[PDB]
Amino acid sequence: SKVYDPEQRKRMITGPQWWARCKQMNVLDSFINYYDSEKHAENAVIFLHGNATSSYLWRHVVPHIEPVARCIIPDLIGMGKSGKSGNGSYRLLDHYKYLTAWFELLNLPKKIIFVGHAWGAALAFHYAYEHQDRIKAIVHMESVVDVIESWDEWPDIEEDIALIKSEEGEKMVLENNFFVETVLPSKIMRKLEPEEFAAYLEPFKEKGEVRRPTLSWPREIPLVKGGKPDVVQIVRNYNAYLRASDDLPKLFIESDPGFFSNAIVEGAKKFPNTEFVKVKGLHFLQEDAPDEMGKYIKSFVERVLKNE
């Protein structure tokens, strides 16, 4: 494979280098792999990836925030180096079951800070809706902010989701690894070095059912027309909560030109007490502007801690 950027290779963190910095813990009938910076545990900043990725997504972002608060970054169940779900189901509520059980083992403070990307933001938002007294602040980006009606730059979203929900979508993902091999690199502006792509491919290198989480995630999409009713209700509930959460400081990181960002920025602006920043990127913006993102998050967390 070609290599691309001598400067990026100089500071690159491979899959094995990242995993060697992680911890593991049994959770319910399985286990979670996670990064835990440990220090400054009076606060906790929990970073949640979404589909196709793992805790590895945050590897160049977290160093900026670790000096200010304990940073904890799980691989969602069935993803990264975590164990598999006991029944092989990977819906939003399955992820939420393992995630919340893991939280109970971490010795968390009363009020937690969440940093969410994409479906990881949905998990944070649903946790917040159900634990409204446990939230210090929320950072979100390229996130599931609301139900999805008509996205101007994705006029075919309903047909594309119908394909993914059909048996053909199963072949695209389980046989051809569509989300890791096609969507992931297409929505990073730079070229990943081979070792970086290998870290994302590793959990899903074999064909078949091991790739189920990457198919189940898009099938959860909260489309008004045809979205899974339980997810649609979850998102409607947490959206209305966020719209009235005047006391809850938020940071929204817009991606320029972005992937979801164009459609969701209006929705993010409907949540009170939001600071707005912008970085270059498509969907997986951590791969294009990790240091700018890390510095913005660090500043935001520092301000939140000063004001309290």
Ligand X SMILES: Nc1ncc(-c2ccc(O)cc2)nc1Cc1ccccc1
Q: Which is nearer to Cl ion, 169 or 290 (CB)?
A: 169
**One of 218, 227, 258, 294 touching ligand X (CB under 6 A):** 218
Q: Which is nearer to ligand X, 9 or 171 (CB)?
A: 171
Residues that bind Cl ion (CB under 5 A): 51, 217-218
Least CB distance from residue 127 to ligand X, whole Å? 18
Q: How many residues bind ligand X (CB under 6 A)?
A: 8
Contact between 36 and ligand X (CB under 6 A)? no
Residue 263 and residue 144 in contact, taking contact as beta carbons nearer than 8 Å: no
> CA quadruple 6, 11, 12, 17: dihedral positive or negative?
positive
Least CB distance from residue 284 to ligand X, whole Å? 10
Least CB distance from residue 140 to ligand X, whole Å? 13
Measured CA to CA, the distance from residue 230 to residue 228 in angstroms comes to 6
* Binding to ligand X, residues 219-278 (CB under 6 A): 221
Contact between 170 and ligand X (CB under 6 A)? no
Q: Which residues pair with 27 in a beta bridge?
A: 30
| Residue closest to 18 by CA, chosen among 4, 45, 1, 36 | 36
The torsion angles phi and psi of 278, rounded to 5 degrees, stand at -145, 135
* Binding to ligand X, residues 44-103 (CB under 6 A): 51
Measured CA to CA, the distance from residue 154 to residue 259 in angstroms comes to 10
Q: Which is nearer to ligand X, 37 or 51 (CB)?
A: 51
Q: Which is nearer to ligand X, 46 or 144 (CB)?
A: 144
Element of type H or E holding 27? strand 23-27
Q: Which tokens go with 130?
A: 């159900």
Q: Are strands 30-36 and 70-74 parallel, antiparallel or unpaired?
A: antiparallel
Q: Which is nearer to ligand X, 128 or 148 (CB)?
A: 148
* Binding to ligand X, residues 137-156 (CB under 6 A): 144
Query: SS3 for 71?
Result: strand
**One of 36, 66, 130, 160 touching ligand X (CB under 6 A):** 160
In the list ligand X, Mg ion, Cl ion, none, the entry touching 41 (Cβ below 5 to 8 angstroms by class) is none
By Cβ distance, which residue is nearest to ligand X? 218
Q: Which residues pair with 35 in a beta bridge?
A: 73
Helix, strand, coil shares of the chain, percent, nearest 5, are: 45, 15, 40
Least CB distance from residue 236 to Cl ion, whole Å? 19
225: left (phi over 0), alpha (psi -120 to 50) or beta: beta
Binding site for ligand X (CB under 6 A): 51, 144, 160, 163-164, 183, 218, 221
Name the site residues for Mg ion (rule: CB under 5 A): 156
